[PDB]
C-alpha cells in the first residue's frame, strides 16, 4: 500500500502529511501518486471525492520543491477548480501543509475582491487555485506580473469546466498558457469520454486513462418557505428525545461555521464539517458521527461525495447546493443505500419552484409540503437581536451572510435563479441583523 | 424671486403638535452634559480608587456623523433645521434620505435642535437605535412624519416656490 516512506520526498512534505491522520494512502492514490512522477501527463478519473486531492496534489509540492529556489515569482502551478465551493475547499487542501514553505497559494475566485486578488498577485504567488473566466481577466491584465514561467497545469473537477459555456475561457487560457515546458493534466472523479474530443487541446504524448472502478426506494422530501429568512425548529424533528440521525446540507464553510455556533446556542447536538477543519477534525467528527446515533451534522458539497453514515433519518438539502447531478442522483445515499430509512428536505424560497419543475423535468414524482412557521416570533428574535460573531467585530457574521450570497451568486442559468428577481436582489430580504432586509 | 424645487422644501416643516411630540421624545435623550461625564467619572474614579455597563444612549448629532449613519444605512429619524448659515450644507439630505428610505423630518430652527443636544446649534440631529421604552413611540412617531410630512408633500419636489 502507498505510505509516506517509499517516495523519498522531503522530510517536511510527507512528515506533514503525517499530520492529516492518514497512516497510508488509498488505492486510487496508489494508482496515481508514484505513477504520476515523470514528465508524464495524467488524466484522472476515479471515485467521486475519493481523496484525489492528495493524488494529483502532491505533484505540485514535488515538482516545485525540486525547483523550490526557482522562480518563486512566476507562479508555479495552476489548478482550475470550477465550483466556488470546491475551489475554496481544495484550497483548504492547499492549507494542507504547515511545512509548505516555498509555496504561496492564490485563492482566485468568482466574487472575491479583484483589487485584493491581483493586489496579492503582484507579490508573485507560487501556486494558485482559480476559476477560469476572471482568471482570463488576470492573465489579460496582470500576466506580466505572474504568467510566463508556469510549470504544471491541472484541470480539477473538469465536470462543468469542459461543458459548454466555459469553453471560451478554457481555449483562451490554454492558448495563452506557456505550454512549452507545461505539464498538461486533465482531472476529475468521473466524467465522459466527450472530455477527450473536448480535450484535443493541451494533450501531447504520455497520457493514459486511469479508471479504478432519483432512486425510487427513496422519495425526495420537499418544503416551501416564502420568507427568505427561513428557520426551522429541528426540535420537532428532534422530538424523539435527543435521538435523531440528521444530515444537513448548506452552502459554504463560513455559513456552516455560523450555523454551527448559532444553532449551538439554540442548544442542539452540534457537529459540523467544512473546508476549514483540518483532516484531523474531519476524521474526528465524521467518524464520531459513525460512532454517533443521536444527533445532526452539517455538510456542504465537501461531504456530498461518497461518505457514509448509514440510515440517516433526514437529509436536509437546505439552500440547494451546486450540482443537480449530485442533487438528484446522490440519493442512493438513503435508498438505495445502506438500506436505512428517512427522507430529504430542501427549504425553498418560493419563486424557484421551477427548479422543482426542472427536477420534475427530471421526472421524479414528489409529494410533501407542510406548514413551517416563518412567523415563529422567537426564532425571529432568537437570532438577529442576539449578536455573536458580528458581536466580535462588524466584519463577521456578515461573512456568513456574504458567503451565502456568493455561492448563491455564482449560480445564474445553472439554477433557475433570475438575474432580475431574487438572484441576487429580492433574496436580500434575508440581509442582516436588521429586518426587514430591503 | 422664484426658488428652485430643491429649496422651498425647507419652509415646509412639522407643525406645532408633531414637533412638540418629537421633543417630548428627544428630551429624554439629551446627550449627557460635560459636568455629567465629570460626575460619573469622578464617582467611579474614587470607587475603583478604593472599592455591568449597559450601552449608553443619546441622539447622534454630528453632521458628518449623521450623514455617516445614513448611507450605511443606520438611522431611524433625522431632524434637519430650516436655517443653516451656509444654507448649502443640508440641501442634499432630504433627497438622500429619500432615496435611502430614511425618515427625515424638518424641524424648525437650529437653536431648537441645538438646545436638546447641549450645544448652541445643530441643524442636524438624528437617532437610529433607541431604548425599548419608546420604541413604540418611535414607530408611531416616524409613522406620523411619514403620514404628515411625507404623504401629501410629494408636491414639494416640483414647483419652484417664491
Amino acid at each position: 500500500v502507498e505510505k509516506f516512506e517509499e517516495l523519498k520526498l522531503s522530510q517536511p512534505t510527507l512528515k506533514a502529511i503525517e499530520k492529516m491522520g492518514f497512516t497510508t494512502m488509498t488505492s486510487v492514490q496508489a494508482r496515481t501518486i508514484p505513477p504520476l512522477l515523470a514528465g508524464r501527463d495524467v488524466l484522472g478519473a476515479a471515485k467521486t471525492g475519493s481523496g484525489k486531492t492528495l493524488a494529483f496534489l502532491i505533484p505540485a509540492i514535488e515538482l516545485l520543491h525540486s525547483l523550490k529556489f526557482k522562480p518563486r515569482n512566476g507562479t508555479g502551478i495552476i489548478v482550475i477548480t470550477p465550483t466556488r465551493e470546491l475551489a475554496l475547499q481544495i484550497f483548504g487542501v492547499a492549507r494542507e501543509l504547515m511545512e509548505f514553505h516555498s509555496q504561496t497559494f492564490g485563492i482566485v475566485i468568482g466574487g472575491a475582491n479583484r483589487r485584493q486578488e491581483a493586489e496579492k498577485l503582484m507579490k508573485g504567488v507560487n501556486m494558485l487555485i482559480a476559476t477560469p473566466g476572471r482568471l482570463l481577466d488576470h492573465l489579460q491584465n496582470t500576466k506580466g506580473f505572474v504568467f510566463k514561467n508556469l510549470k504544471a497545469l491541472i484541470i480539477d473537477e473538469a465536470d462543468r469546466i469542459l461543458e459548454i459555456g466555459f469553453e471560451d475561457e478554457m481555449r483562451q487560457i490554454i492558448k495563452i498558457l506557456p505550454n512549452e515546458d507545461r505539464q498538461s493534466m486533465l482531472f476529475s472523479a468521473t466524467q465522459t469520454t466527450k472530455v477527450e474530443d473536448l480535450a484535443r487541446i493541451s494533450l501531447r504524448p504520455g497520457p493514459l486513462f486511469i479508471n479504478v472502478v432519483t432512486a425510487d426506494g427513496l422519495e425526495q422530501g420537499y418544503v416551501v418557505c416564502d420568507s427568505d429568512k427561513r428557520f426551522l425548529l429541528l426540535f420537532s424533528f428532534l422530538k424523539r428525545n435527543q435521538k435523531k440521525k440528521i444530515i444537513v446540507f448548506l452552502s459554504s464553510c463560513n455559513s456552516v461555521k455560523y450555523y454551527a455556533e448559532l444553532l449551538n446556542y439554540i442548544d442542539l447536538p452540534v457537529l459540523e464539517l467544512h473546508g476549514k477543519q483540518k483532516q484531523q477534525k474531519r476524521t474526528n467528527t465524521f467518524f464520531e458521527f459513525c460512532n454517533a446515533e443521536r444527533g445532526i451534522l452539517i455538510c456542504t458539497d465537501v461531504a456530498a461525495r461518497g461518505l457514509d453514515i448509514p440510515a440517516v433519518d433526514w437529509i436536509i438539502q437546505f439552500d440547494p447546493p451546486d450540482d443537480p447531478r449530485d442533487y438528484i442522483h446522490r440519493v442512493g445515499r438513503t435508498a438505495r443505500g445502506t438500506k436505512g430509512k428517512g427522507k430529504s428536505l430542501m427549504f425553498l424560497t418560493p419563486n424557484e419552484l421551477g427548479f422543482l419543475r426542472y427536477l420534475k423535468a427530471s421526472k421524479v414524482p414528489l409529494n410533501e409540503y407542510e406548514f413551517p412557521e416563518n412567523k415563529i416570533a422567537n426564532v425571529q428574535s432568537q437570532l438577529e437581536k442576539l449578536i455573536k460573531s458580528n458581536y466580535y467585530l462588524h466584519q463577521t457574521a456578515k461573512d456568513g451572510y456574504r458567503s451565502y450570497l456568493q455561492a448563491y451568486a455564482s449560480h445564474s442559468l445553472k439554477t433557475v435563479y433570475q438575474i432580475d428577481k431574487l438572484d441576487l436582489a429580492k433574496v436580500a430580504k434575508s440581509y442582516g441583523f436588521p429586518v426587514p432586509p430591503k | 424671486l422664484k426658488v428652485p424645487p430643491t429649496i422651498a422644501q425647507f419652509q415646509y416643516t412639522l407643525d406645532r403638535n408633531t414637533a412638540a411630540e418629537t421633543f417630548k421624545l428627544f428630551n429624554k435623550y439629551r446627550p449627557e452634559t460635560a459636568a455629567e461625564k465629570k460626575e460619573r467619572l469622578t464617582k467611579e474614579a474614587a470607587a475603583v480608587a478604593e472599592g455591568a455597563s449597559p450601552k449608553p444612549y443619546a441622539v447622534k448629532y454630528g453632521l458628518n456623523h449623521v450623514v455617516a449613519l445614513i448611507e450605511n444605512k443606520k438611522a431611524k429619524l433625522v431632524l434637519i433645521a430650516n436655517d443653516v448659515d451656509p444654507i448649502e450644507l443640508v440641501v442634499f439630505l432630504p433627497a438622500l434620505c429619500k432615496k435611502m428610505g430614511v425618515p427625515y423630518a424638518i424641524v424648525k430652527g437650529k437653536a431648537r435642535l441645538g438646545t436638546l443636544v447641549n450645544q448652541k446649534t445643530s441643524a442636524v440631529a438624528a437617532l437610529t437605535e433607541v431604548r425599548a421604552e419608546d420604541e413604540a413611540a418611535l414607530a408611531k412617531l416616524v409613522s406620523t412624519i411619514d403620514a404628515n410630512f411625507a404623504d401629501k408633500y410629494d408636491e414639494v419636489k416640483k414647483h419652484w416656490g417664491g
Binding site: L233, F235, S236, L238, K239, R240, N241, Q242, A377, N378 | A132, E133, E135, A136
Partner: protein, 256 residues
C-alpha cells in the same frame, strides 16, 4: 370515594382513544372536567388556587418539553425594592437541588413601561407557560398584564406570599419556590356552571400518577364546593364518567 378501576379503565382505554393515529400538543393533553349548580356568583374573580397533588407534572413538563417546540420557561415578579436585594446569581446557588431554575426576575414597573405596547406585551408573556408573581403585586397585576394573559391558566400568574415577617429574607423564596413547585398545581375558579382543570400530558408518567391525581384532586374539591357531576377527557373527548352525584343535587331546592 370514587372507584379506582373506573378511572383506570377510562385512562387506559383513554390511551386507546389516543393510540389511534402543536396538533399533537392539542390532542394528548388530558383534562379533568367538573361542574356544579353554580360557581361563585356575580363576581369575576381572577384568584388562583395552589392544589396539593400526588406530585407535579412540572418536572415532566420540563424534561419532556426540553426538546419541545415551545420550550416553556420560568418567570417571577419581585417587588420594587427587593430586586436589588435578591440578585439573579443569588437564587441560582439554591434552586438547582430540585433541578428547577427561573429565567427572569422583573418589576411590574418594567411591565408597565417596556413590556406595555400590547404586542410587545403579549409577545413577551406568550412564550411562557408556568408563571410566578407576588401577592402584594398580584393585586396590581389585573391592569398591567391586561385582558389577554388571564385567558390562560398557563399565563395567569400564580400568587405567593414571598415576604417574611417582617422584612422579608430570601430563605422563604428558596424553599417556597419549591413549595409552589413540587406539591402544588394551581387552578382557577371562574363563573358559570362549569370548570375544567387542565390536568396533564398523557405521554408523561404511567397512569399510576394520573389516577391518584384524579383521586386527591377529585375528593379534594368535592368537599368544599359541593359539585354536581365530574368528568374526564383528553382535550377533545366526549366526557368520561367517574362520580355521578345526585345527592348534593337536591341542595338546589335547599335555597330556592
Amino acid at each position: 370515594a370514587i372507584p379506582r378501576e373506573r378511572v383506570i379503565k377510562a385512562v387506559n382505554e383513554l390511551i386507546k382513544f389516543t393510540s389511534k393515529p402543536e396538533e399533537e400538543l392539542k390532542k394528548d393533553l388530558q383534562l379533568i372536567v367538573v361542574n356544579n349548580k353554580s360557581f361563585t356568583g356575580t363576581s369575576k374573580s381572577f384568584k388562583l388556587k395552589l392544589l396539593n397533588v400526588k406530585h407535579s407534572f412540572y418536572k415532566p413538563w420540563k424534561e419532556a418539553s426540553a426538546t419541545a417546540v415551545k420550550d416553556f420557561k420560568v418567570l417571577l415578579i419581585l417587588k420594587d425594592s427587593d430586586i436589588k436585594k435578591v440578585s439573579e446569581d443569588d437564587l441560582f446557588d439554591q434552586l438547582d437541588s430540585e433541578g428547577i431554575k427561573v429565567d427572569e426576575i422583573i418589576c411590574g414597573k418594567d411591565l408597565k413601561t417596556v413590556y406595555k405596547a400590547y404586542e410587545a406585551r403579549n409577545a413577551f408573556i406568550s412564550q411562557f407557560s408556568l408563571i410566578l408573581a407576588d401577592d402584594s403585586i398580584v393585586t396590581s397585576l389585573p391592569k398591567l398584564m391586561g385582558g389577554k394573559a388571564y385567558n390562560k391558566v398557563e399565563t395567569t400568574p400564580i400568587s405567593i406570599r414571598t415576604h417574611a415577617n417582617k422584612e422579608f429574607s430570601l430563605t422563604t423564596l428558596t424553599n417556597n419556590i419549591k413549595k409552589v413547585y413540587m406539591n402544588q398545581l394551581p387552578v382557577k375558579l371562574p363563573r358559570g356552571t362549569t370548570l375544567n382543570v387542565h390536568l396533564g400530558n398523557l405521554e408523561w408518567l404511567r397512569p399510576e400518577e394520573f389516577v391518584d391525581n384524579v383521586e386527591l384532586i377529585s375528593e379534594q374539591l368535592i368537599k368544599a364546593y359541593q359539585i354536581r357531576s365530574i368528568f374526564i377527557k383528553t382535550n377533545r373527548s366526549p366526557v368520561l364518567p367517574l362520580y355521578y352525584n345526585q345527592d348534593v343535587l337536591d341542595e338546589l331546592e335547599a335555597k330556592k
